[PDB]
């Protein structure tokens, strides 16, 4: 039913948030600095 707040529940929310952000397709490919192939 109900639940209190716990650091366990905080980490449980944060890991789901970071996973749902990490599995975004633009995030999976894009990077900030081009490499020696892209610069060429």
């Amino acid at each position: 039913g109900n639940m209190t707040l716990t650091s366990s529940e905080i980490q449980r929310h944060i890991t789901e948030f970071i996973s749902s952000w990490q599995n975004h397709p633009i995030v999976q490919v894009s990077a900030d600095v081009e490499n020696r192939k892209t610069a060429q």
Binding site: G1, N2, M3, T4, L5, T6, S7, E9, I10, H13, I14, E16, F17, S20, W21, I26, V27, S30, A31, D32, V33
Partner: protein, 1065 residues
């Protein structure tokens, strides 16, 4: 270890170790009153300081020659000063003070201004008036603080004695260098000891309500009380912001040069632009990577409708293409002996080459080291520095391009050769289009708009149509003024492909006179109005007549309308100038009058017409003067592509012009400078001295952006600094807590180190709690009502709530509804059991538990008015009213909070993110600043009254005025019927999307049949949105999607309680 033996059980309560309690709070506040001023310095004597805090304090601070060669007496027998360096050297000098003192009784060491000198000054002695002038202005400079500094330093010593803290998000300790590595406190100890020396009691000045007292020694000068208030700010901000000490040492070194200077405030006035000039105006000489936002504003560009569309990485081509900085930034340091600071800043600035949180926090920590003090000078020199300047018209308009007078107005013939006809036609068209409106002619609107000299410690009846036609220019002709949406303007304008030019007008009040502006404007308004209004009178002025010599053929009578009759009576007021009158209490025998051409400082109608005059001259710049005065057709092509509806924003004197990116990248950054020279040349022809700036950043309404950055100015407001204009005493004691809460809520919007900031806010909060009148004392729950988050209570996890929690009953709902099954366990954990079960707390007597812990008494005691409303006996009345709330025992909370507490929610799953993690949105907040970094990504940043109360009070109860009965408004307006408002804290976030989508009023498994809102009384949804979005913001970490679970009494019987509160009002 003295502070440890004194404050053992309190520091563990506010560091996350032990649970917070009221008795430890009150036993600490008992001891906070019991401190001598020497005890703070005894506590400072024991801390071992490291080698990296030691720097050479100069000896020349203490020995300053006295004030006889600084002031003199002008003709008309007013006191002035003679300046030694520059004509703006009118501030307080630094000299020896002790020779003008006689000691107080009850303590020998401290003196005040002697009564014989003020007696002879009131009599009319020459030297005595100068001496009491210096004494009163030194008192007024020393007075500019909120509370005595020893209390702030003691709160620092209490709060930062708990060592490092622990993060429940990053699961690690923090690494912040302690008190041994804190240079402002080392200097604050050394100066205050070297003043006293062999003499004990070691406090260089004490602070009272009406006046100060000075330590009687030859070591005491006037520079010290601003210098100590300057050092305490850096000593706090080095702790609670995580500043780099390599910048804090420079910030202290500049202040030591300021105290060693001829004057302190004047040196800081001349050195207030070292940190942003070397750091912020010189960023990214070589750019290699980083993310930047991707905004655009929608195509009706006057609407200022913005849109966030992802974030793209930077490329090599978007470096700093703006011109250089070295030739003048090094010159500023070489003039004042700060080259060891300026070169130190430049070589450290040249090492950052990527755009991430690190280089952004570098800019924040560099801007923090400017000294935020309040400059103090007498009004008799404020006037005769500010109000004696005048505009210079290098190209005036000739006498051929006027006709003879129509009364007191000459008209401008349209065959003029000057630029003033473009100023003339905009005001003329504005008057001609406002006079044709139907609304300006019913008598009710004229009554609504109805509803000599001026001084300092009746123009608004006849100067109407100037303002009334200024509003038409600002809101219908050229919608360039944004008179909440200023943020996305600068985030677009600071992006990589576009640049921005920070145009500021110097001396906006001394700007416009009868010579160029007011004559043409009062000629245009006298002619645009007289077409539509012929004989029809205004509010109270009648129609009239006056002769003319418009055409040179004849002269005739030509009856005046009546609305232009005010133009006739008002241009004779503008034609001569204004009359001021002064009397400073800081120098007796100084009382005169003065004639200017400038305007008053802070009126309302003096802003709108200046904005209209800004936008009009910018439009005629970009249209006419531009192409007629330049070669280099890149500059011509650049000028012919932009207009002020598409890119120019102005709000006052300052403006912002945006030059967008083309297909080929960014605009060539040399033709922009060639246009800047033409702006500066254009201003000289009619008196404006622009303060144009081009570096790669955006400055508008004093907000600093770089690549869309949200850089806060920490030194915009200091902590221990308060403005005082007069010499009067301040308000009594129980109103200081509003400024202490102001310190906290101002620290919220700046991204401080949040565990350190809350922990220091507790130390201030417990220091300002007790006063002699049994003494008065606020319990610690009275401050929790005021929006102050907690650390660890009722046996919970440490560092568990956030300071994004609201204040009031909506704040009290949230943390109780989060902690409740633990609280009802902790009550039973020590003998607080009753037989019946409550629907909220169960079988535990919440009434006795809250009465003994004094939670009720804080809850009702915080709602008492802190204003001693209209004598010491009224203060005693307020004190007895405040003590009566503490002596009375209470049964329950208010009817609103009890009606709230029947609602139960649930935290199912976290929402998908709203913005990129690696994108630097806002400065200071980063993964090192864990909780705002989670909240701002999970929610998203904001990128897109009695009548309204009482009509909803009568509408929701069973009972435009024909429209309101059936329509609805949004949640933030419909839910103001129970006085719920979106708090000050949530203003820099996106509460709209959170209310509209991510607070569901329906459980995940369908419909529980208990949460059935009727079709009647559908206003309850707008309050359940707020009650849902409370706990989804108070809980630290990710803002979670929240679903409705239970209403205990039923949804129909829930709102009957709200209706009982509406009948009870």
């Amino acid at each position: 270890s003295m502070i440890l033996t004194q404050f053992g059980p309190f520091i563990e309560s506010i560091s996350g170790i032990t649970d917070q309690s009221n008795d430890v709070f009150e036993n600490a506040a008992k001891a906070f009153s019991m401190f001598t001023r020497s005890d703070v310095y005894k506590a400072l004597d024991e801390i071992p300081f490291s080698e990296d805090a030691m720097l050479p304090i100069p000896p020349t601070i203490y020995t300053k020659p006295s004030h006889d060669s600084y002031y003199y007496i002008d003709a008309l027998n007013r006191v002035r000063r003679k300046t030694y360096q520059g004509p703006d050297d009118v501030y307080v000098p630094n000299c020896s003070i002790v020779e003008l003192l006689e000691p107080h009784e009850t303590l020998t060491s401290y003196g005040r201004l002697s009564e014989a000198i003020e007696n002879r000054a009131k009599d009319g002695d020459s030297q005595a008036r100068i001496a009491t002038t210096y004494g009163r202005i030194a008192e007024s400079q020393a007075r500019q603080i909120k509370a005595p500094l020893e209390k702030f330093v003691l709160a620092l010593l209490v709060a930062e004695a708990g060592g490092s803290l622990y993060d429940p998000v990053l699961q690690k300790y923090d690494e912040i260098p302690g008190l041994s590595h804190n240079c402002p406190l080392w200097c604050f100890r050394e100066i205050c000891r070297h003043i006293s020396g062999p003499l004990p009691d070691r406090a260089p000045y004490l602070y009272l309500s009406a006046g100060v007292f000075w330590l009687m020694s030859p070591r005491m000068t006037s520079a010290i009380p601003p210098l100590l208030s300057d050092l305490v700010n850096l000593a706090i901000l080095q702790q609670t912001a995580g500043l780099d000490p390599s910048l804090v040492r420079l910030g202290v070194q500049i202040c030591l040069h300021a105290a060693a200077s001829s004057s302190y405030a004047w040196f800081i006035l001349k050195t207030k632009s070292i940190f942003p000039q070397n750091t912020l105006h010189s960023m990214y000489e070589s750019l290699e990577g980083g993310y930047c936002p991707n905004l655009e504003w929608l195509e009706p560009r006057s609407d200022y409708k913005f849109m966030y569309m992802g974030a793209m990485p930077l490329s090599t081509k978007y470096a700093r293409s703006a011109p250089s900085n070295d030739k003048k930034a090094r010159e500023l340091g070489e003039k004042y002996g700060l080259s060891s600071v300026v070169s130190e800043l430049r070589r450290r600035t040249k090492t950052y080459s990527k755009h991430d949180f690190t280089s952004v926090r570098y800019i924040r920590d560099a801007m923090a080291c400017t000294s935020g003090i309040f400059l103090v000078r007498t009004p008799t020199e404020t006037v005769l520095q500010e109000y004696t300047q005048s505009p210079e018209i290098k190209v005036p308009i000739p006498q051929k391009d006027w006709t003879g007078p129509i009364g007191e107005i000459r008209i401008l013939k349209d065959t003029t050769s000057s630029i003033a006809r473009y100023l003339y036609r905009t005001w003329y068209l504005a008057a001609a289009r406002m006079a044709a409106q139907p609304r300006t002619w019913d008598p009710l609107f004229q009554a609504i708009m109805r509803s000599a000299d001026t001084s300092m410690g009746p123009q608004q009846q006849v100067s109407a149509p100037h303002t009334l036609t200024a509003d038409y220019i600002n809101y219908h002709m050229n919608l360039s003024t944004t008179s909440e949406k200023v943020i996305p303007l600068g985030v677009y304008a600071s992006s990589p492909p576009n640049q921005s030019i920070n145009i500021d007008i110097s001396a906006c009040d001394a700007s416009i006179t009868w010579d160029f502006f007011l004559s043409v404007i009062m000629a245009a308004i006298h002619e645009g109005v007289a077409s539509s209004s012929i004989g029809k009178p205004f509010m109270g002025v009648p129609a009239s007549i006056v002769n003319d010599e418009s055409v040179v053929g004849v002269r005739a009578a030509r009856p005046i309308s009546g609305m232009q009759n005010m133009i006739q009576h008002l241009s004779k007021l503008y034609k001569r100038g204004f009359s001021y009158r002064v009397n400073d209490s800081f120098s007796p025998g100084n009382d005169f009058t003065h004639m200017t051409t400038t305007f008053p400082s802070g009126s309302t109608a003096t802003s709108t017409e200046h904005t209209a005059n800004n936008s009009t001259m910018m439009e005629t710049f970009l249209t006419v003067w531009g192409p007629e005065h330049t070669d280099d057709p890149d500059v011509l092509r650049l000028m012919k592509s932009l207009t002020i509806q598409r890119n120019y924003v102005c709000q006052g004197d300052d403006g912002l012009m945006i030059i967008d990116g083309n297909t080929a990248g960014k605009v060539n950054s040399e033709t922009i400078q060639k246009m800047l020279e033409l702006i500066s040349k254009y201003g000289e022809e009619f008196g404006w001295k622009y303060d144009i700036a081009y570096d790669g950043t955006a400055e508008y309404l004093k907000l600093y952006f770089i690549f869309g950055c949200r850089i806060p100015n920490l030194s915009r407001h200091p902590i221990v600094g308060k403005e005082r204009a007069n010499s009067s005493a301040e308000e009594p004691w129980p109103a200081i807590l509003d400024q202490i809460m102001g310190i906290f809520f101002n620290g919220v919007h700046d991204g401080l180190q949040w565990q350190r900031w809350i922990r220091y806010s507790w130390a201030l909060c417990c220091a300002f709690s007790r006063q002699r009148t049994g003494y008065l004392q606020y319990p610690m729950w009275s401050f929790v009502y005021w929006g102050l988050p907690l650390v660890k209570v009722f046996g919970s996890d440490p560092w568990i709530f956030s300071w994004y929690m609201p204040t009031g009953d909506l704040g009290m709902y949230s943390w109780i509804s989060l902690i409740r099954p633990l609280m009802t366990r902790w009550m039973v954990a020590n003998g607080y059991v009753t037989d019946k079960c409550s629907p909220v707390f169960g079988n535990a007597d919440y009434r006795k538990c809250f009465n003994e812990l004094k939670l009720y008494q804080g809850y009702y005691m915080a709602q008492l008015p802190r204003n001693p409303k209209k004598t010491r006996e009224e203060l005693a009345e307020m004190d007895e009213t405040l003590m009566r709330a503490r002596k009375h025992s209470y049964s329950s909370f208010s009817k609103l909070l009890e009606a709230y507490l029947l609602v139960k929610w649930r935290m199912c799953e976290a929402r998908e993110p709203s913005v990129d993690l690696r994108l630097p949105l806002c400065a200071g907040i980063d993964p090192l600043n864990s909780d705002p970094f989670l909240k701002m990504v999970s929610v998203g940043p904001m990128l897109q009254n009695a009548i309204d109360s009482a009509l909803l009070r009568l509408r929701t109860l069973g009972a435009l005025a024909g429209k309101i009965m059936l329509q609805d408004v949004n949640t933030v307006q419909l839910a103001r019927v129970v006085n719920l408002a979106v708090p000050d804290t949530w203003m820099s976030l996106d509460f709209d999307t959170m209310f509209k989508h991510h607070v569901k009023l329906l459980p995940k498994d369908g419909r529980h049949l208990n949460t059935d809102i009727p079709p009647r009384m559908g206003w309850l949804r707008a309050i359940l949105r707020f009650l849902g979005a409370g706990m989804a913001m108070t809980a630290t970490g990710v803002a979670v999607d929240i679903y409705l679970e239970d209403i205990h009494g039923g949804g129909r019987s829930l709102g009957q309680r709200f209706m009982t509160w509406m009948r009870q009002e």
